[PDB]
Design a protein around this ligand. Structure first.
Ligand SMILES: *[C@@H]1O[C@H](CO)[C@@H](O[C@@H]2O[C@H](CO)[C@@H](O)[C@H](O)[C@@H]2O)[C@H](O)[C@H]1NC(C)=O
Ligand SMILES: *[C@@H]1O[C@H](CO)[C@@H](O[C@@H]2O[C@H](CO)[C@@H](O)[C@H](O)[C@@H]2O)[C@H](O)[C@H]1NC(C)=O
Ligand SMILES: *[C@@H]1O[C@H](CO)[C@@H](O[C@@H]2O[C@H](CO)[C@@H](O)[C@H](O)[C@@H]2O)[C@H](O)[C@H]1NC(C)=O
Ligand SMILES: *[C@@H]1O[C@H](CO)[C@@H](O[C@@H]2O[C@H](CO)[C@@H](O)[C@H](O)[C@@H]2O)[C@H](O)[C@H]1NC(C)=O
Ligand SMILES: *[C@@H]1O[C@H](CO)[C@@H](O[C@@H]2O[C@H](CO)[C@@H](O)[C@H](O)[C@@H]2O)[C@H](O)[C@H]1NC(C)=O
Ligand SMILES: *[C@@H]1O[C@H](CO)[C@@H](O)[C@H](O)[C@H]1NC(C)=O
Ligand SMILES: *[C@@H]1O[C@H](CO)[C@@H](O)[C@H](O)[C@H]1NC(C)=O
Ligand SMILES: *[C@@H]1O[C@H](CO)[C@@H](O)[C@H](O)[C@H]1NC(C)=O
Ligand SMILES: *[C@@H]1O[C@H](CO)[C@@H](O)[C@H](O)[C@H]1NC(C)=O
Ligand SMILES: *[C@@H]1O[C@H](CO)[C@@H](O)[C@H](O)[C@H]1NC(C)=O
Ligand SMILES: *[C@@H]1O[C@H](CO)[C@@H](O)[C@H](O)[C@H]1NC(C)=O
Ligand SMILES: *[C@@H]1O[C@H](CO)[C@@H](O)[C@H](O)[C@H]1NC(C)=O
Ligand SMILES: *[C@@H]1O[C@H](CO)[C@@H](O)[C@H](O)[C@H]1NC(C)=O
Ligand SMILES: *[C@@H]1O[C@H](CO)[C@@H](O)[C@H](O)[C@H]1NC(C)=O
Ligand SMILES: *[C@@H]1O[C@H](CO)[C@@H](O)[C@H](O)[C@H]1NC(C)=O
Ligand SMILES: *[C@@H]1O[C@H](CO)[C@@H](O)[C@H](O)[C@H]1NC(C)=O
Ligand SMILES: *[C@@H]1O[C@H](CO)[C@@H](O)[C@H](O)[C@H]1NC(C)=O
Lengths: 621, 177, 338, 48, 48, 39
């Protein structure tokens, strides 16, 4: 099988730092570290992990010895050389068979290569190893499998990494792993004989997308290329006045639920750290928007409805709910885009001898349609009497939320204020304290114009934007042009670089040289992008100046233009065909030859009559 | 494929979840697998229609090329078709078009008609071809010159309407006998 | 007859999840619902390349018209190539190119003027903004003209012999005489009415030009093919503003408004909507490609029959007793002159 | 030889939502998933 | 019991089928077995 | 562009009540009202 895996691997032909020994820098740990060493009998004992490597953060120790290993997760202090001096709050000791295995054929020449890879995905410490006799005279190029030994859940934070030495009276090959897609070839017996990366070379990527090891001659579409934006531009409106959330959260007479006070918030900058400050929060249920991401969106209008209410009705207050308050006093819309706030208040709604100023309604003719106020004192009819008064079968509509300093949490005077938003396509006026960066044109940038997130290239334009116009679109309803909030000018929006990369190669049994064709893109654009390192493709094919070609199908990189004409072998597009021809061998691009250039000898009185014939047998399938 | 469900194994999910909540994941899995099966069936139907077209073309090619001679150009291979032989192939057929292809040619001369005695002569079948000195009549797809006699050519004309007419004598086997 | 449509290489990842890693991760849970679509579109494009190859590249050798043009009085300037024109196309071929408007040329490399669009960005730029690109045909509309010119020059100086083996020259009056002999009328008729036949042919060739000039749309089949392509693509791109039962239609807006563990519901809804729309588009494109394959196989056999010889089949090479036919290149199609 | 078959012009709007305004409004959120069907069937009938 | 349709519950891996002896080359850490299409093919017996 | 919109509009060739002045009856409000006056 040719199973394809996506996992943390050591990149092929990557950077590996080779050390020496004769003090022990702490190499950083991230996404796993690949380790290798060659030694005669033994000089490396173990490795030390953790953060800050002191008696304040849980740490690791993988020290080996003659017969076992001494795994533990503890909080050592230091040794500066008996490798620790503290085991105070330390558990999870582990001992098993030794990782190191050394064999010699009656000679010390067999310096077996010991290979190790560790990683800490979702804790669950993984340790993989393999001892190969390839002797270590050079860092070898043969394929070597790596099998796991133990796999144990530390579940701690690891950022730094160190190593241990031995005593005595060329090693430390360290690599770093990265998330890559790998295609591994499994032998008939289950071992892994061969594997190739999918983000190293164009031929490697084709080999990945057509999963196999032999790539037949032709042209293969593999992926797309995109110019990732360089800078991030945020252009918020020209307003700096802080919103009056202070003045709605500093109030002393939050009206009752039967009459929900409704304030409007407009023409201000909304920072919600002031929301957090004046709030021993108890209920931060937000539905339309995530509370953590609240400073980065621009709202056309904000409504602040505030009312004191009992504890359980706080849980009542939510889109699509039921109860005497959610039915007769305050109903939120089912498609509510907003968030609710509730913090306890036993100091302003309570006093000795009690307080009964607050009110609520349990008696209404029908349910309350959403965001409606129903201040009215009409006695609910019972039976069939037009009775107007209090008493039996003649009930007052609104009852009292009497609040005293001594109730349970279910009966305590909770303070509830809701925030109503409207995030649609409209000229926004209220949003976060995010600063307004500069504006740079003719460059791939992520724009955040007045809450309109996106990416692309912007420049000057000659639209005829009417004074109320703010946006721009097309018959397909896609945002085209935006007006600058702090400049009042018109800028168009461009796709980032969208295209598609196709690799032109002969059969791998013939050669490994490849050509790259970027479809439908001017080749100056990719050349400057590859020079600034802003292309999503991580395989950087060489460009020596002689291999560049503006085709009508895009631009070709890796093959040179010969002005001859042949029956071609690999179609490209727009009358251009690439081939693997001798120079001593290279890939060449040439215009198609439609055939042999022939001229007939037509005349007034000339006839050509065949004096002979042949019999040919063709085949049709 | 999980299709957005907790897991992609029915035997696992049924034994892992009690049905009232397991039904959500199961319904997701049906929603995914049904659509995948519909895609497979649609592609198979389209490929079956294409193979129908190819097989009808193969059937008419067999009935024409094999069971007779076809006057259609290039249909039974390139060149003047003569026969064909069918061969069985796995999930297909292979035809062996045997075709007549002309060869080495010589530029001679030609005349639309020959005026013997005030009458234009036209070859009954073939071309009036001249070696260069003595006019002849031969076939079309092969060179086989013959003496211009009154049987190889039919006569109707007035020696004054045809353009490019070349003077020559036509023979008759009747005056001699 | 239509010969091919526009080639597309729609990219599912970008089309469904515009540069969103979370959306890509969610889409990875749907298996190979994308590789199948990419393979189908690539197969369609390669198939249509093969289609144009079959229709036009019927001659291995390129013939060229003799420098002098006197074919017995028959006037062939209208279909023979014009050296003066930069595109080397006949006047009858130029009208067909002028009367067909392609929404997306493809060989434009239009990136660089989306910023330069100044006014509202057009349909092509909008498509580029959302993951839909068009590949150009392998055979240029200029080299197809070379193929057509070769096929035309071979059938008026060599008769039908160049369609079978080596090209053998024959005077045009004699070729006409043999085409006449193929339908049961003797050659003396032509050799006696040569001038009248030449005048009739010249008048007919002259009058078909005006018939194509003044007609509203006689090329309606090719225009219908182009319109169907553009309309299917526009209906696809219009599905990117459909909420599909989600709170909003903008992935960038949604990812920035809702935290992932809740947003994943809306992302999944958008995934199911856009995947099904893309499946519908791919299925319809496959059906249309099969139809175009059928029509262009008909065109190929028509070329090999009527152009490379005389056909005894009634009405197949035009109405009446067929004599000849002259191919003409058209945008995404071919035009025969029976 | 078959020459033609029955021509159908089914109506998605009511076929999905029998005279129901709420269902029609919800269906409007699916985009032009109906105009495509009507166009395909109309083209089939005209071609027939 | 081998060579008989049985429901297996190997180490929590539910399923049904017929099991028998094999000549696999299971490495010591190997526990499961799959195929090219990612379907469980062979299992290692926990107690043998 | 030929953008198509669904929104409250004044119907084409609809009934429009033309008043005069020389008292000011209240007109009902529903789904919006189109107002015009020349002076
Ligand atoms: C898979 O494993 C088999 C069992 O060990 C191997 O078969 C062996 O092959 C050796 C020769 O290498 C014989 O000497 C021995 O008797 C046995 O048949 C088999 O080769 C192996 N296949 C591989 C590694 O590809
Ligand atoms: C027509 O062409 C034939 C081959 O295509 C010729 O036959 C050849 O005969 C020679 C002997 O003279 C052989 O050596 C050769 O292998 C082939 O069989 C044939 O002679 C030729 N005839 C004429 C009239 O040109
Ligand atoms: C015209 O065709 C004649 C065929 O009959 C050729 O004449 C031949 O010439 C030889 C002597 O050279 C005679 O012996 C023979 O009987 C025959 O007549 C003649 O070559 C040919 N002319 C040209 C120019 O090809
Ligand atoms: C073929 O032979 C005819 C007589 O056998 C020629 O007719 C002659 O034409 C000349 C004028 O060209 C007259 O003056 C003469 O009286 C006779 O009619 C005829 O021209 C000739 N044609 C060719 C092409 O040689
Ligand atoms: C073949 O037919 C051509 C038609 O395109 C003739 O060209 C014409 O040339 C005249 C000027 O002499 C133009 O006024 C006219 O519009 C047309 O282009 C061409 O002369 C004709 N040639 C022969 C030999 O018949
Ligand atoms: C490895 O490091 C050396 C030295 O910095 C550098 O020249 C080389 O390019 C690196 N390898 C790769 C694959 O970049
Ligand atoms: C090595 O570590 C093991 C771990 O338990 C310990 O028992 C042993 O005494 C240590 N020393 C040797 C020489 O094995
Ligand atoms: C273990 O951690 C607890 C946490 O409060 C601490 O109180 C205690 O002193 C620690 N034990 C040590 C340092 O031995
Ligand atoms: C782990 O340590 C790094 C380095 O200080 C820190 O940035 C990160 O937040 C830590 N993570 C946890 C879960 O402690
Ligand atoms: C209310 O205003 C007073 C005035 O200084 C301030 O001290 C207090 O913190 C405010 N409380 C709230 C909840 O805003
Ligand atoms: C934005 O505010 C600054 C500071 O007052 C001012 O100089 C500038 O003119 C303003 N621009 C607009 C467009 O209001
Ligand atoms: C694309 O082509 C060239 C090369 O980049 C250059 O003129 C410019 O960038 C573009 N030109 C046009 C006409 O789009
Ligand atoms: C040879 O190729 C060059 C470009 O590489 C071109 O400018 C030149 O015209 C070609 N020569 C001929 C004779 O085609
Ligand atoms: C054919 O004849 C015409 C008129 O007689 C003349 O213009 C032309 O040059 C001739 N061509 C040849 C090849 O003899
Ligand atoms: C006959 O001679 C002409 C004169 O050049 C030549 O062009 C033509 O190719 C010749 N035909 C042959 C050799 O079959
Ligand atoms: C399982 O446990 C039994 C009881 O001790 C023992 O006899 C048997 O060998 C064990 N098998 C394995 C594979 O551990
Ligand atoms: C407008 O009102 C008049 C008088 O009531 C009526 O005749 C006319 O039909 C109305 N317009 C329309 C479009 O019904």
């Amino acid at each position: 099988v040719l199973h394809l895996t996506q996992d943390l691997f050591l990149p092929f032909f990557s950077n590996v730092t080779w050390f020496h020994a004769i003090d022990n820098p702490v190499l950083p740990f991230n996404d796993g570290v690949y380790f290798a060493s060659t030694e005669k009998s033994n000089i490396i004992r173990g490795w030390i992990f953790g953060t800050t490597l002191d008696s304040k953060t849980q740490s690791l120790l993988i020290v080996n010895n003659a017969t076992n290993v001494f795994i533990k997760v503890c909080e050592f202090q230091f040794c500066n050389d008996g490798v620790y001096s503290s085991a105070n709050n330390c558990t999870f000791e582990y001992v098993s068979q030794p990782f190191l295995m050394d064999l010699e054929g009656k000679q010390g020449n067999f310096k077996n290569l010991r290979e190790f890879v560790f990683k800490n995905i979702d804790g669950y410490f993984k340790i993989y190893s393999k001892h190969t006799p390839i002797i270590g005279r050079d860092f070898p190029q043969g394929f070597s499998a790596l099998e796991p030994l133990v796999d144990l859940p530390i579940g701690i934070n690891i950022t730094r990494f160190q190593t241990l030495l031995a005593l005595n009276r060329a090693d430390y090959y360290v690599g770093y792993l990265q998330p890559r897609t790998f295609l591994l070839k499994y032998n008939e017996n289950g071992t892994i004989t061969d594997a190739v990366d999918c983000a190293l070379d164009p031929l490697s990527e084709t080999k990945c997308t057509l999963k196999s090891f032999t790539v037949e001659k032709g042209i293969y579409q593999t992926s797309n290329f995109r110019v990732q934006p360089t800078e991030s531009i945020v252009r918020f409106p020209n307003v700096t006045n802080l919103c009056p959330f202070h003045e709605v959260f500093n109030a002393t007479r939050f009206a009752s639920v039967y009459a929900w006070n409704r304030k409007r918030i407009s023409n201000c900058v909304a920072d919600y750290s002031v929301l957090y400050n004046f709030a021993p929060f108890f209920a931060f249920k937000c539905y339309g928007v995530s509370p953590t991401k609240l400073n980065d969106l621009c709202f056309t209008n904000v409504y602040a409805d505030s009312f004191v209410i009992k504890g359980n009705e706080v849980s009542q207050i939510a889109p699509g709910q039921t109860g005497n308050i959610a039915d007769y006093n305050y109903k939120l819309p089912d498609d509510f885009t907003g968030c609710v706030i509730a913090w306890n208040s036993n100091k302003l709604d309570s006093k000795h001898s009690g307080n009964y100023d607050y009110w609520y309604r349990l008696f209404r003719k029908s349910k309350l349609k959403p965001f409606e106020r129903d201040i009215s004192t009409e006695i609910y009819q019972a039976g069939n009497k037009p009775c107007k008064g209090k008493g039996p079968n003649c009930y007052f509509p609104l009852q009292s939320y009497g609040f005293r300093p001594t109730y349970g949490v279910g009966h305590q005077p909770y303070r509830v204020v809701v925030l109503s938003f409207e995030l649609l396509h409209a000229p926004a006026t209220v949003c976060g304290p995010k600063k307004s960066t500069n504006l740079v044109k003719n460059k791939c940038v992520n724009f955040n114009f007045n809450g309109l997130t996106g990416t692309g290239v912007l420049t000057k334009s000659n639209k005829k934007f009417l004074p109320f116009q703010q946006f721009g679109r097309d018959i397909v309803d896609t945002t085209d042009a935006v007006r600058d909030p702090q400049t009042l000018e018109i800028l168009d929006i461009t796709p980032c670089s969208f295209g598609g990369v196709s690799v032109i190669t002969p059969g791998t049994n013939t050669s490994n040289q490849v050509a790259v064709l970027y479809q439908g893109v001017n080749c100056t654009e990719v050349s400057v992008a590859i020079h600034a390192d802003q292309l999503t493709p991580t395989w950087r094919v060489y460009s020596t100046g002689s291999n560049v070609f503006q085709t009508r199908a895009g631009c070709l990189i890796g093959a040179e233009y010969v002005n001859n004409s042949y029956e071609c072998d690999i179609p490209i597009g727009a009358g251009i065909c690439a081939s693997y021809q001798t120079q001593s061998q290279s890939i060449i691009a040439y215009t198609m030859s439609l055939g042999a250039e022939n001229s007939v000898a037509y005349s007034n009185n000339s006839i050509a009559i065949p004096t002979n014939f042949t019999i040919s047998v063709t085949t049709e399938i | 494929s999980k299709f957005g469900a907790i897991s992609s194994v029915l035997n696992d999910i049924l034994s892992r979840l009690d049905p009232p909540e397991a039904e959500v994941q199961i319904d997701r899995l049906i929603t995914g697998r049904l659509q995948s099966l519909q895609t497979y069936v649609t592609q198979q139907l389209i490929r079956a229609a294409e193979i129908r077209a190819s097989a009808n073309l193969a059937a008419t090619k067999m009935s024409e090329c094999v069971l007779g001679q076809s006057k259609r150009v290039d249909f039974c291979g390139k060149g003047y078709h003569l026969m064909s032989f069918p061969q069985s192939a796995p999930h297909g057929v292979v035809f062996l078009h045997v075709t007549y292809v002309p060869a080495q040619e010589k530029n001679f001369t030609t005349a639309p008609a020959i005026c013997h005695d005030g009458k234009a002569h036209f070859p009954r079948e073939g071309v009036f071809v001249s070696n260069g000195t003595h006019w002849f009549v031969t076939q079309r797809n092969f060179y086989e010159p013959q003496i211009i006699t009154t049987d190889n050519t039919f006569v109707s004309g007035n020696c004054d309407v045809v353009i490019g007419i070349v003077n020559n004598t036509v023979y008759d086997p009747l005056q001699l006998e | 007859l239509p010969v091919s449509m526009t080639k597309t290489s729609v990219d599912c990842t970008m089309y469904i999840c515009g540069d969103s890693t979370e959306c890509s991760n969610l889409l990875l849970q749907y298996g190979s619902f994308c590789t199948q679509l990419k393979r189908a579109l690539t197969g369609i494009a390669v198939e249509q390349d093969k289609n144009t190859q079959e229709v036009f590249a019927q001659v291995k050798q390129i013939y060229k018209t003799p420098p002098i043009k006197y074919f017995g009085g028959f006037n062939f300037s209208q279909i023979l190539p014009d050296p003066s024109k930069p595109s080397k196309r006949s006047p009858i071929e130029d009208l067909l190119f002028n009367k067909v408007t392609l929404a997306d040329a493809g060989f434009i490399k239009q990136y660089g003027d989306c910023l330069g669009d100044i006014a509202a960005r057009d349909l092509i730029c909008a498509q580029k903004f959302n993951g839909l690109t068009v590949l150009p045909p392998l055979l240029t509309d200029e080299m197809i003209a070379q193929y057509t010119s070769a096929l035309l020059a071979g059938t008026i100086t060599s008769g039908w012999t160049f369609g079978a083996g080596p090209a053998l020259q024959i005077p045009f009056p004699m070729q006409m005489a043999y085409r006449f002999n193929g339908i049961g009328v003797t050659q003396n008729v032509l050799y006696e009415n040569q001038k009248l036949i030449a005048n009739q042919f010249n008048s007919a060739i002259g009058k078909i030009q005006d018939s194509l000039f003044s007609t509203p749309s006689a090329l309606g089949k090719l225009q219908d093919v182009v319109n169907h392509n553009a309309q299917a693509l526009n209906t696809l791109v219009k599905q990117l503003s459909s909420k599909f039962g989600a709170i909003s239609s903008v992935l960038n807006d949604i990812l920035s408004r809702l935290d992932p563990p809740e947003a994943e519901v809306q992302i999944d809804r958008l995934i199911t909507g856009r995947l099904q729309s893309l499946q519908t588009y791919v299925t319809q494109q496959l059906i249309r490609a099969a139809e175009i394959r059928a029509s262009a196989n008909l065109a190929a056999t028509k070329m090999s029959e009527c152009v490379l010889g005389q056909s005894k089949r009634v009405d197949f090479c035009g109405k009446g007793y067929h004599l000849m036919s002259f191919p003409q290149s058209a945008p995404h199609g071919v035009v025969f002159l029976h």
